[PDB]
Symmetry: C3
Subunit: 217 residues, 3 copies
């Protein structure tokens, strides 16, 4: 129902210790990247946020992260979900710590929110108060600065991004032009923490507005 | 069943009255683009044709138009369909005029056509007699020149395009190599209105022939 | 169930006997490519392997070969499957021979293999003893050399590729980074025939290992969280 949280799920987790040189080459790993932590989940943007959180908690880097075409509901195999993330670190210890931080964040109550009665429109509006090394790089902003991470389906996202930009003193850093691999859209916005928060609130209200009246113009 | 029209549906329409400058920057809008019209539907190629029609009825430009991966049948949310289109114009009234023309066209009886008994193969074979500003740019031709807009599933499209090019006095402008986002394929062909119609008929006939004999190649 | 073969199916096959110049241009065909053979099927990597086998049987080149977004189980039309392949040759007779070889290979018993009880995880671990002109060009090796053709879903593939590279004297030629259009991943590895076989064996074992215990990490390392 409307305002219900859609719980994200982790599907599989594995560690690679002493990664093969051939694989290290193709992933373009650094010399201190000896171990990899692999994760898949059924919700990509929650996982991207959680991987960023991991870079704060442990000496890991996000070296690979991609979404699956047409999203988790169209997965053809059990563990594909709609995202794969790869953390790299100096040892299995640091990679396990990074994976533990990722898992803790994914279970923390964050997620997409339903905008209607059968949960067929949903959105993500997450304020990241202090970015780690992954989302700051993706947005092109300085490490440690705040972001608003806003995602909705294509039309809702375009309409609601406009409302979010008018509601607060925020800049658009990165535009997820529709379609993303999962057929969503959105953006990463930056500004002060309170402005990002304001942007999140306005974004959520605007998506809900479209959901309640999709054809009115 | 065979030759039935598959009716396209509009899922959502919105107008942004005064677009924020941050948005205008990322969409690379021109300074006179003040208002946006947004539309989603469950059929991309009909919608692209309709958006082109809107540019003939009003002073609007198509500034954004993209298809969704794996098509409307695989949509995960209610309003995503398989296409988003964005019109831009100098005012909300002009954008409204453009969207009305888009909706009327989508409702006019155009659409994909079934090639078989359970509608599991379908194609689009549409003669655009006078292109607007969107399809003419896309195809690289003068505004007002004719197009055949031909779309089918991947093998059918390759086979039927060859037939259409042989049957009719037409040139290939743009090739949609398989897969498009929706896992279709096709092309835009130009020529006289008469030749584009003949290309449409030959394309339709060839798609039907593949549907009726999908494994036959020894003759 | 586990170790069952998943049978691949051909959906459509056609020949264009004399290709139009307009189409020849867009496909960037060679001057001696006069005829095209078209094929779709519900399994892409088996079909790519079969197309390579065709280049050994007839005077044909693979000029086009692409997978469909989100795979065959999400196809919206009957004949799209998850792959289209296009063979080109100098005459309909050669294309005809190439397509027959392609069909025969697809029916030969090769395929993806199930990794678990409900066939919800599957993988391809195929030892190509003697590459034709298509896979050799793709991998950057000489025609006739061996390949290990390894495909699985994204996390399984990454884990199992590492196992395969450590199991034998093989080199990574081509890496299919996740996701491919079908949301799989994998690689082409080369080495001697026996090394490619060992790599196939280790890959298959590693995929099965993940399938039977995808979240063991939780018990072992996420305790008291
Ligand atoms: Na589906």
């Amino acid at each position: 129902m409307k305002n219900d949280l859609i719980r994200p799920n982790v599907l599989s987790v594995k560690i690679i210790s002493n990664v093969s040189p051939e694989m290290a080459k193709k992933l373009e790993l650094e010399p201190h990247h000896k171990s990899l932590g692999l994760i898949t989940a059924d919700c990509d943007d929650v996982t991207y946020t959680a991987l960023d959180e991991a870079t704060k908690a442990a000496e890991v880097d996000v070296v690979y992260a991609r979404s699956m075409y047409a999203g988790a509901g169209n997965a053809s195999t059990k563990l594909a979900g709609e995202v794969i993330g790869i953390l790299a670190g100096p040892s299995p210890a640091e990679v396990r710590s990074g994976l533990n931080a990722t898992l803790d964040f994914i279970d923390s109550g964050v997620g997409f929110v339903s905008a209607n009665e059968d949960d067929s429109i949903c959105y993500y509006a997450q304020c990241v108060s202090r970015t780690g090394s992954y989302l700051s790089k993706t947005a092109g902003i300085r490490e440690g600065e705040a972001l608003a991470y806003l995602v909705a389906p294509p039309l809702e996202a375009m309409y609601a991004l406009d409302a979010a930009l008018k509601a607060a003193d925020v800049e658009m850093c990165e535009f997820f032009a529709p379609p993303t691999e999962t057929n969503f859209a959105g953006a990463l916005l930056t500004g002060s923490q309170s402005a990002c928060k304001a942007a999140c609130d306005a974004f959520a209200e605007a998506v809900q507005s479209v959901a309640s009246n999709p054809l009115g113009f």
